[PDB]
Every structure is written in C-alpha cells, then in structure tokens.
Amino acid sequence: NLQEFLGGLSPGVLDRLYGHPATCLAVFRELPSLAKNWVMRMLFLEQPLPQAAVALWVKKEFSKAQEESTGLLSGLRIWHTQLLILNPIFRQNLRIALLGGVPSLDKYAEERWEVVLHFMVGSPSAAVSQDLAQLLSQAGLMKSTEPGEPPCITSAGFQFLLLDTPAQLWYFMLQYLQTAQSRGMDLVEILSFLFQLSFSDSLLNFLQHLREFGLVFQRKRKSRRYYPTRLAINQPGFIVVETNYRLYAYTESELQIALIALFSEMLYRFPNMVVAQVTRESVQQAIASGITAQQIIHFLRTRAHPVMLKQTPVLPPTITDQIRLWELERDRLRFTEGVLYNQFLSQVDFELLLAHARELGVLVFENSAKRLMVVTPAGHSDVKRFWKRQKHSS
Amino acid sequence: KIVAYELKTGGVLLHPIFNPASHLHFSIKHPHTLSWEYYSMFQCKAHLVMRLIENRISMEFMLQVFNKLLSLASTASSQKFQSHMWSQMLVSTSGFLKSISNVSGKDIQPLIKQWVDQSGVVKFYGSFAFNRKRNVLELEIKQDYTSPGTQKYVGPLKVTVQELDGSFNHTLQIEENSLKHDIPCHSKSRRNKKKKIPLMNGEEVDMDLSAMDADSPLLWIRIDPDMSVLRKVEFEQADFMWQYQLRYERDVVAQQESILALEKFPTPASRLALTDILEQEQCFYRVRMSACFCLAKIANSMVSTWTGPPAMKSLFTRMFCCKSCPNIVKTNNFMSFQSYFLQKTMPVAMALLRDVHNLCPKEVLTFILDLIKYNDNRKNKFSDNYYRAEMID
After folding, report:
1. Which of A16, A159, B82, B166 shows the smallest number of beta carbons within 10 Å?
2. Does residue B153 belong to the interface with chain A, where contact is any CB pair within 8 Å?
3. Are A345 and B264 in contact (CB < 8 Å)?
4. Which of B213, B214, B264 lies at the smallest CB-CB distance from A346?
C-alpha cells in the first residue's frame, strides 16, 4: 500500500518529498481516522507540547487507535519530540495547502490497459513497444532470455494477470517506482506527480510511460497540458458458474476469454457468450504455471454474473472445494545451498553454535536430537572460525 | 602408569647399549644409580613389552620359550664343570630372541626395535565422520610425536567398530603420511525391525536406539581395543556413543574409558547411564566404584539443574539400608565382597557433592554421620576396620 511505500523511506527523502503543492495533502488523506484531527490541531502552534498530553488526549476506550496513529505518524516523522511540534517545513506547506500561498478518457484507459494485458499474454496481435517490453521484463513478471524470440511469461506473471485491475495497476506502478530508482530516475519528482494527479527530461519520460500505460492522454500531439483518466487518480460481472464445472461468460473482449482459458477448457464461443469447462487438466495446468486456487476463486467471484449474486455464497461450494482440493493435490520440491557438520560431542555446547548461524542468516535447518546443523557455503568461513574459537575456549 | 611417567620425564629404555639416555638426570649403566621410580617403571614396562611379544607370538609358544630356558638351566644346574656349562643358566637378549626364533620361526626384531631399543610411547588423537552417501566411516588418526616422551608409530593398528549389525574389527596401516582411513560400514536393518544387536562376545542385547543418529549405524568405535601398543588414545566420540559403550560393552577397559570420558558430558542421559551401571550387579565391581566418583563429578557440574535428592543417596538406601527404615543402615554382613567394596566406596564419593554455595550439603554429611552411628559389626565373620576407615575418609 501507499502507506507501506511512504513508511519505507528515510527522513532526508521524506522532508524533500513533502513538496508544497500536493504531497502534504495526499499524505494527509492517508491518515486513517484521528491523526487528521491532531494534524489540524497543531498546524497553528509554534511551541512544542508534552507527550503526556497527547497520551491522555484519548479516552481509555479505543486507545489502540491512539497508539497506532502515533506510531504511524512517528514513522512518517511529521513531528519531533524536541524534548511534539510538527516539522516546520511540513507545517508551512500544510498551511499553504489550507487557505494559504471524460467518457472517452475512461474508454481510452480501458483499451490501453487491455492491449497491455494482451501483450502480457501470448496474444499474436498486440501493441509493440520495446521500452514497455523491457520494463515489464525487468519488473519481475516477465523473462525473455532471447531478444529474437518474444519473451515468455514467468510464474509471477500469471498471478499478476489474474489480479483485479486496481490492485494490478497499483502493484505495477509500485514496481515502476522501484525500477525507476534502479534506472536512476529521481523517485521524489515522479512520486509527487502521482499525488498531484489525484487533485524536465525525467518528467517527460515518466509521463510518456504513464501515457503508454493509459493513465493519461495529452490528446494534443503531446502537449504540456494533460487530462488524466480515471485510473490516474488511483463493474458488473459476466461469468455464470454451474454445479458441473461449466462456465458461461458473456465476454466479447478477447482478454477475458484468454484469462478464462488460462484455467479452463473452452468448448464453444458465441458472439456474446463463451462456454468453458473447469477440469482437472486446466486447473492443474494453471497451478503448475504458478497460480493458486485463491486467485482463481477471487477472479470468478469478482467477475460473477448478477444472476448468481442472489444465491449465497455466490460461487457454489462444490466448485470452490473442488478447485481447492485440486490445488492441494500438488506439493512440490525446493532448492537451497548448504553444508553439514557432525560429531558435536557435548549437548549444551551444540545449543550455543545454533545461535551463531541464526544471527548471521546462514542457518537453514537445525536438529537438537542428532546435532545436525546445515550451513550455507556463503558463510562457511565465519562459522568454522567460531567453532574453532569455541574449541579453544573448551 | 607408564604413559604418565614417560610423558612426565623422558622415557624408560629397556636394553640400553653402552650415554644412551641423556634426557634424565641419572645414569642407567648400573642398577644402583637408578632412581627408584625409574626402577619401578622399568619392571612395569618390561612386563608390558612381554605381553606385547605374547600378542605377536602366541601364548603357548611363549610358555614353550620359557620352558626351553628353564630346561637349559636345569640341565646346566646339575653339571660339576666350573662354568663350562653353568653359563647356560644366564640368559641374554640375543639368546632370548634366538630361542623365540627357534620355537616360532618368526623373529620379533621390529617389535624389539620399536618398544625396547627406542624408549617412547605413542599418542593417538582420533576423530571420525560418517559418510552417509558411500556408507563409509572416515577415521582421522593423528599422532603427537613432537612431545618429549613420544615416538612415531608406523605399524598396523586394530580398531573395533560396533554397528547395529554387530562388532567388526578392522586393521589400519598408519604410515607417516597417513591421516584419513576409510573403513566400510554395514546395514541398519536392525533399526527397521526391533531385533537384538549382537555384541563383541556371542550374546546380543536390547538397546534403546532413541539416542542414536538416524543416518549412522555405528554405535561406538574403539581405537586399539586390545592394548597392543604402548599408547594413550584421545578419541572424540559423541556422548551417546560413550553412554552405549558404558552400558552394553563386554570389556572392562572400555567401560572404564567411557566413565573417564563421560565427565566432559554432564547431560542427564550420562547420569542415567552411570546410575544404571551402579545399580547393575554382573558389572565388574571396579567399574561401579569408578562410576561413583564420575557420578559425583557430574552431579557437582549440573547444580541448579538437579531435581531430587543428592546423588547415590537413594541408591545407597535402596541397596544397603533396611526396607522399613531408610536412614538406618543394615547391620554389617560383608560376605559378598563386591557390595562390601561398593558400600565402602559410595559415601566417599558421595561426600564430594557440593551445593550452589560450594559447601557440602548437610543432607550428605548427616547421612555419613548416621552411617557412622548405626554401624553394627557383631554379626559378620569379617572385620570392620577398612569400612570405618573409609567412613573417616
């Protein structure tokens, strides 16, 4: 979430990111319930106040809200104890932010995201863009390994595909920012634009990428002015599920049919409907590709036709249980690197060695009944030395 | 005794050649210049080297050597010629080796050259590792040959490995550049079924295999079990292997060395092992007398963990006191000669118990004083002087 993204930041980047135009307001809206009230209170105070007052300024009931809000805003570093006055820069910017100093667009965003997903899946016809392809490849959801051949889809790719559009886009933009820092694009400048949307060379490239994603559209041969789409700020279902593992989806866009075929066997395709079967073969194929039953169940539930909404639960218990059992049927091997010792002599002496590999992060599996500790070869030169020291101590 | 003396000061040189031994402060050319401790260790090393010659050339051939010497002497002892034949009553080293070579056809000149003419004992440091993939046991035996009393051994070396399929002997060739010796290991199909594990002798016993490793079949290893060299072994087993070697071995020197090596592992499984040795008649009595002192040392080391009464007290009241009165000792009947020795050695080890304050507990001192007060010896056919003297000790 955006709260996680902002919490994972340093004070030096935080105060700079608190730009005058929008950031002080976008981060304010994040404040879930009560911290808004305290920010408004001590927006006009130039004198810090004791912490005991803030502690006792919430009744005994519902105090956990007080502690959680205080911790969240301490992490955000909106104020400092100074002994709880707010940061002067944030106070000034917030005062400046508080009395101081379309139908075609949504369709465009939908179509652009749909073609992006078409390219993501193995669609022969899709929009071509080398920058988009390499960005998706380095986002961790795609791997090519051969420039001549079109890139394939990794295991995480299917999971990302089956996610809903809001979370899908949000995670995609999170990965975009994380890779922006890697490629060298300043994070603060690009981040501030997202906040400003909900109200330079790097800016132009970032806006080009956003337009490729379909969140914005200049509409004037790439002019300075832009008109953000609905997705920039941040529908009825069509699938009918039977009790015999049969799906009737009122789908005209090929994207939905492809998504359903990812985990179902298609039987018929009518102009305004398509018939598929959820069989062991298709479900286990999806599970092997990497999906888990939770994504499939959530996808079918969110794309649930209004006819089946009346029944509770919306998705039949037999279908849900069958999908879950099919996914459980498979349990899979793992991969790690390690080295094992033996002849550990005294018992109380083996317990002290277990804490050496656990603190360094090179321990995989321990055994106090046989004395059997696995150590990765990456930290083999540090565990052996410790063992030698212990032997010397005797 | 001899490895302690030879590592302490130089070494004992049987058969010197005329100084041959300059590492020690007296001359070994005459018996009246020898130190008395050197004379005692000389006789001790001489009879151990004769046991080694019996190990190479069997005991019946050895008794035939001695009978040939005695028979030459007794044919010599009846002549009247003034020493034409009376010098057959005098033995030498060359005559003894020649009589050995006459009766057996083997000469012992490497063994004589190593253990007589050379004046040193050997030190063995062993450690093992079990290779689960190739099912082998990789021993690692290194010698300390740079100490002042030591020498380098290059002969063969017997090792006895007790695995789940039984006890197997292996001969290792320990040349100068040798360090790793790979010996093969057998199955672990006596852990699949509960079957009895066969011992060094022909018998077999039920073992509790819960402490054993799941991947290794081997229960214990003994380097040079028959004491066929003049050696000091320092083997690094795991503590459960020492406990299995204390419980189920049919060799008293291995039970003694496992008692000696269990003092470094104060775990409660070792306390259970020594307590099961102490309760066990049909164990040799000098092993139980050592297990008393080992149990006292282990009990001193695991204070602030010890649960019930002090060590060996409940065991003393179970073995040697009345059933109706626990604190009154039974009247003295010393006719068993093994529970007499164990009874007179158990409070002596029990008095080495110490509390968290480093003072002997007043539960053991009161127990010893009640052993002294309630002592009645008007009924046995034996005297009480050694038992009362051990009570004062």
Report:
1. B82
2. no
3. yes
4. B264
Indicate the burial class of A192 (C-beta count within 10 angstroms; 0-12, 13-18, 19 or more): buried
Beta strands A227-228 and A216-217, pairing class: antiparallel
Report which of B221, B215, B203 is spatially closest to residue B163, judged by C-alpha positions: B221
Phi, psi of A281, deg, nearest 5? -60, -55
User: Residue B267 and residue A343: Cβ atoms within 8 Å?
Assistant: no
Contact B238 A344 (CB under 8 A): yes
Q: Which among B48, B193, B181 is positioned nearest to B121, based on CA atoms?
A: B48
DSSP classification of residue B321: B
Per the listing, tokens 């949307």 go with A197
Phi (first) and psi of residue A265, to 5 degrees: -95, 120
Nearest CA to B250 out of B299, B294, B197 is that of: B197
CA distance B22 to B18: 12
Q: Give the closest residue to B320 by CA, choosing from B370, B263, B262.
A: B370
Rg (CA), chain B: 26
**Cα torsion angle, B139, B145, B146, B147, sign:** positive
Deposited resolution, Å: 5.5
- Residue B62 has φ and ψ, to the nearest 5°, of -65, -45
DSSP state for residue B87 in the 8-state scheme:
G
Which of A319, A263, A255 is closest to A286 using CA atoms?
A263
Of B129, B213, B264, the CB nearest to A370: B213
Instruction: Give the integer Cα–Cα distance in Å for A348 and B299.
Output: 15
How many other C-beta atoms lie within 10 A of the C-beta of residue B337? 9
Determine the residue among A339, A341, A344, A346 to mutate to test chain B binding: the one whose Cβ has the most chain B Cβ atoms within 10 Å: A346
Is A344 in the B-facing interface, judged by CB distances under 8 Å? yes
Residue A165: CB partners within 8 Å, gap ≥ 6? A113, A231
Phi-psi label, residue A290: left if phi above 0, alpha if psi -120 to 50, beta otherwise: left
Residue A342 distance to chain B (closest CA, Å): 7
The rounded distance, in Å, linking the Cα atoms of B127 and A82 is: 63
Chain A neighbours among B 197-226 (CB < 8 Å)? 213-215
Of all helices (H) and strands (E), which one includes residue A263?
none
Query: Which residue among B129, B264, B267 places its CB closest to the CB of A342?
Result: B129
Element (H, E) at B303: none
* Residue reference for tokens 């277990």: A354
Report the DSSP pairing between strands A216-217 and B122-131.
unpaired
> Tokens 């004395």 belong to which residue?
A371
> If contacts are CB pairs under 8 Å, which of residues 366-385 in chain A contact chain B?
370-372
Interface contact B392, partner A, CB < 8 A: no
Q: Crossing angle, helix A317-328 and helix A280-289, to 10 degrees?
A: 50
Experimental method: cryo-EM
Distances from the Cα of B329 to the Cα of A247, B100, B111, B318, angstroms = 89, 58, 55, 10
B215 vs A contacts (CB less than 8 Å): 370
Residues 6+ apart with CB under 8 A from A339: A374, A375, A376, A377, A380
Q: Do B128 and A343 touch (CB under 8 A)?
A: yes
The residues near A284 (Cβ < 8 Å, ≥ 6 apart) are: A326, A329, A330
CA distances from residue A124 to A46, A115, A251, A252, A256 in whole angstroms, order as listed:
63, 11, 19, 18, 16
Min Cα distance B304 → chain A (Å) is: 14
Nearest CA in chain A to B266: A346
Task: Determine whether the interchain pair A348/B267 forms a contact, defined as Cβ–Cβ distance below 8 Å.
Answer: yes
B227 touches chain A (CB under 8 A): no
Interchain proximity B214–A370, CB inside 8 Å:
yes
> What do you get for the CA distance between the two ends of chain B, in Å?
24
